[PDB]
């Protein structure tokens, strides 16, 4: 018996009663999924880490990459049971996760009196140890929001509840110039965004692809630091986004402290010099300096020295965190025990990629001013439990605030892609507001021999009349003709001097992803080693990233004109905004054209003279009848 998500809530108790059960549904689903994954029989490849610990690498085939919410540092148990050796168990931590090229997880085993059976390959099962920490913090944030009046200002409390209270602004000295001296100048769109935010208790910034949301966000934080003369909390749902923003803030000359979980202290990072644990280690002196050297060479500490070590580390951690201009951490990481202090100004980047309870975590620490950056036109949060997603857990705080009447300020100058590539995404998803910060000449290849339908327009929709097939799972589709055409495009790019690293292949179906990879290995015209370096993945893998060339394989083609989740406007937007120099779309226009979004795309391509069919060396205009 769960209350629906409302537009206006009577109080924060009703707010909690709505989001609370949804968090539990997600938590239970995540946990149950890993319980099932613990039953899969796996193969282990053994290796040795530099620190001389054992590494176990393996592939988990039961679930899709997005279904297993596994992070680096997560504890796991690897079990052997079989006829080649007695029963054995081994605890360790995740050191590598699957990527587009490597399908394997890597578990670094904790040292033990009994050595691991490195001579065995099969008979293993892998059980992820359930913590629940992320969901616990979300629940705590909801509860704190409901019962602690000092957790957030009264104005923000009413705004989050959907109440109508008078609008307020801060009596704050605005700077004469928003761009920072000695640094690259903001464009007028970016400058207007910094201007609009500085005196508001709550702001939403929309950052479309390639528009410079990092420099804009870092500049906002820089000014808020000078104005309030107090600590600013900076967050994002992912660790990469946090690191990107922390690096820019450090470059502006701010004292940044990057907080990582105890579990991920050994993770390789671009901002390792900002990590709290590295700041403790380096900035240590006296008794603490000695206890650190001793723990490094001995590997363990005595009972009395451990109690003394913990006390001193906490004291040092607090001193570092207090003297900081900015504290950087993930949204969930904001719930860390070490940050049980007050943060009056909060900026959340990529807030559209988190659920509302996840965003709430950094906001319930005495927040007076909140800036949410995001893009509701790009990918949203990952909600594994369909009932929870259906009930409204997919909606971020950024999107609910829009439904409540908060207009986001949009960054409108893109610097990523060729002007031809930004036209349809701009007109379709950003009300034609996107301007180009790079020219056609800046995004072109002078001596190109690639058979683009019109020279100077680096895009094409290559129609094929193939039909969708079903992969070995029965749960996925593939398109053999589109896979063949994909190889022809790549080989043609290779012949034109384009490198594999410059090319990305996006496909919604795992059947197509596997088939394209295998097909190019066996039937690729050139050396198979070239094709393996071409990234073939779904839009999720490319979210927040870019490639020089992008190939989209639509896969779907049937007499019913059914296209499944190719209907998703957000996925199409992301897939069309990843390329810098060129875009090739492979598909069957006959079935895509029934969808109104895709029909607009085909019409746009036809208006440019880019909707073609036939052989790559003798392309012809596509004959399909498109009707608006």
């Amino acid at each position: 018996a769960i209350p629906p998500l409302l537009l206006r809530y009577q109080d924060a108790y009703e707010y909690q009663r709505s989001y609370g059960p949804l968090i539990k549904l997600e938590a239970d689903y995540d946990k149950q999924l890993k319980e099932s994954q613990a039953l899969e029989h796996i193969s282990v490849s053994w290796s040795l880490a530099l620190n001389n610990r054992h590494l176990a690498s393996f592939t988990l085939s039961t679930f899709e990459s997005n279904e297993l919410k596994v992070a680096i540092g997560d504890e796991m148990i690897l079990w052997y049971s079989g006829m080649q050796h007695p029963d054995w168990e081994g605890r360790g931590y995740i050191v590598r996760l699957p990527n587009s090229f490597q399908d394997t997880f890597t578990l670094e085993l904790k040292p033990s009196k009994t050595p691991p059976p490195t001579h065995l390959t099969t008979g293993f099962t892998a059980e992820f140890i359930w913590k629940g920490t992320s969901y616990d913090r979300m629940q705590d944030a909801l509860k704190k929001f409901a019962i602690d009046k000092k957790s957030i200002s009264g104005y923000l409390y009413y705004k989050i509840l959907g109440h109508q209270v008078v609008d307020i602004s801060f009596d704050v000295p605005l700077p004469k110039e928003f761009s920072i001296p000695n640094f690259a100048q903001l464009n007028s769109s970016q400058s207007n965004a910094v201007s609009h935010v500085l005196q508001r208790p709550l702001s939403l910034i929309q950052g479309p692809p390639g528009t410079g949301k990092t420099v804009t966000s870092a500049t906002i934080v820089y000014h808020l630091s000078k104005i309030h003369k107090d600590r600013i909390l900076v967050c994002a749902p992912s660790n990469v986004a946090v690191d990107h923003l922390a690096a820019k803030l450090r470059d502006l000359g701010l004292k940044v402290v990057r907080l990582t979980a105890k579990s991920r202290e050994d993770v390789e990072s671009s901002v390792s010099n900002l990590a709290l644990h590295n700041l403790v280690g380096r900035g240590a002196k006296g008794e603490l300096k000695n206890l650190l050297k001793l723990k490094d060479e001995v590997g363990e500490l005595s009972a009395s020295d451990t109690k003394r070590f913990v006390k001193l580390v906490r004291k040092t951690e607090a001193e570092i965190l207090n003297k900081a201009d900015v504290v950087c951490c993930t949204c969930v990481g904001a719930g860390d025990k070490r940050l049980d202090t007050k943060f009056r100004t909060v900026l959340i980047d990529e807030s559209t990629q988190a659920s509302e309870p996840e965003c709430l975590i950094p906001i319930v620490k005495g927040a007076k001013q909140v800036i949410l950056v995001g893009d509701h036109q790009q990918l949203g949060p990952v909600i594994l439990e369909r009932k929870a997603a259906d009930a409204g857990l997919k909606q971020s705080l950024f999107e609910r605030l829009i439904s409540l009447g908060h207009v986001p300020i949009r960054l409108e100058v893109q610097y990523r892609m060729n002007p031809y590539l930004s036209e349809f995404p701009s007109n379709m998803f950003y009300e034609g507001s996107l301007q180009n910060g790079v020219t056609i000449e800046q995004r072109t290849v002078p001596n190109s021999k690639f058979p683009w339908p019109i020279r100077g327009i680096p895009m094409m929709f290559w129609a094929n009349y193939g039909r969708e097939e079903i992969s070995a799972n029965g749960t996925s589709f593939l398109n053999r003709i589109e896979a063949m055409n994909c190889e022809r495009i790549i080989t043609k790019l290779f012949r034109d001097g384009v490198k594999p690293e410059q090319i990305g292949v996006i496909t919604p179906y795992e059947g197509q992803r596997a088939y394209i990879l295998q097909y190019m290995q066996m039937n690729g015209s050139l050396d198979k080693d070239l094709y393996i370096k071409v990234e073939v993945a779904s839009v999720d893998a490319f979210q927040g990233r870019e490639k020089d060339y992008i190939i989209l394989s639509c896969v779907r083609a049937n007499e019913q004109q059914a296209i499944g989740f190719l209907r998703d406007p957000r996925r199409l937007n992301v897939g069309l905004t990843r390329a810098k120099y060129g875009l090739v779309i492979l598909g069957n226009p006959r079935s895509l054209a029934r969808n109104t979004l895709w029909n607009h795309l085909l019409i746009h391509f036809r208006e440019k003279g880019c909707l073609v069919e036939g052989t790559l060396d003798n392309l012809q205009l596509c004959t399909v009848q498109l009707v608006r």
Binding site: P3, P4, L5, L6, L7, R8, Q10, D11, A12, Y13, E14, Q16, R17, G20, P21, K24, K143, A146, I147, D148, K149, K150, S153, G154, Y155, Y157, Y158, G162, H163, Q164, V165, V166, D167, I168, S169, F170, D171, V172, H228, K368, Q369, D390, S403, L404, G405
Partner: protein, 219 residues
């Protein structure tokens, strides 16, 4: 109750605010009389959302509308539009209330939206008025913009929920009223560039909102 609200409810208001609307019907009909008019646009658009977009909120909204039409509830009147009324309402009657200087090309709007405007003008100014003041409830900015251009007063679900909390005089209204008067007392009123009512406040002086008592969900 003696205060009476007269509303024309669109599809977006149901799909986005069904939980709020259900609360108005069961709780707020104590001291308030609610009078709903459901246009053909709403039924057709909710059926479209349920079938073509697999919207479970639109499916639940249609089921709720049937419950409203079948029940003899006190202080709640519901009238579902007869589709043949759209053929009687003149498009020239809609055009008489349209602002010529308005940015929307009203005559070029799709059939569904032309008929929603006919329903609204019928209630606001024609035979469907009954000497009552009507408001369109919508959660779609395009619908609210075209209604404003044709002098049809419109409001959001949150606008109505706040108004009904004032009439019910619940703790949500009273505590938000204390907060407003606290801002008016400590803070400078200004007319912003947007024309809005803004209150400049000191960042260092903050008001916290009393939470009151309540029940939390527990696993």
């Amino acid at each position: 109750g003696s205060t009476q609200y007269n509303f024309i409810i669109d599809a977006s208001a149901f799909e986005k605010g069904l939980g709020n609307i259900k609360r108005w019907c069961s709780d707020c009909t104590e001291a308030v009389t609610l009078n709903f008019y459901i246009p053909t646009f709403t039924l057709n658009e909710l059926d479209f959302l349920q079938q073509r977009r697999k919207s479970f909120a639109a499916r639940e909204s249609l089921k709720f509308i049937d419950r409203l039409d079948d029940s003899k509830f006190a202080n709640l009147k519901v009238f579902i539009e007869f589709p043949e009324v759209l053929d009687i309402i003149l498009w020239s009657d809609v055009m008489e209330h349209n602002d010529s200087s308005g940015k929307i090309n009203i005559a070029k709007l799709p059939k569904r939206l032309k008929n929603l405007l006919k329903s609204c003008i019928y209630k606001c100014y024609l035979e469907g008025n009954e000497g009552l003041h009507w408001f369109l409830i919508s959660e779609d900015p395009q619908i609210r913009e075209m209604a404003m251009q044709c002098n049809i007063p419109s409001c959001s679900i949150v606008d109505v929920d706040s108004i009904l909390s004032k009439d019910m005089n619940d703790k949500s209204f009273r505590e938000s009223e204390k907060f407003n008067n606290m801002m008016l007392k400590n803070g400078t009123k200004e007319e912003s560039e947007n024309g809005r009512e803004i209150i400049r406040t000191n960042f260092n002086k903050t008001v916290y909102a009393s939470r009151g008592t309540g029940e939390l969900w527990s696993p």
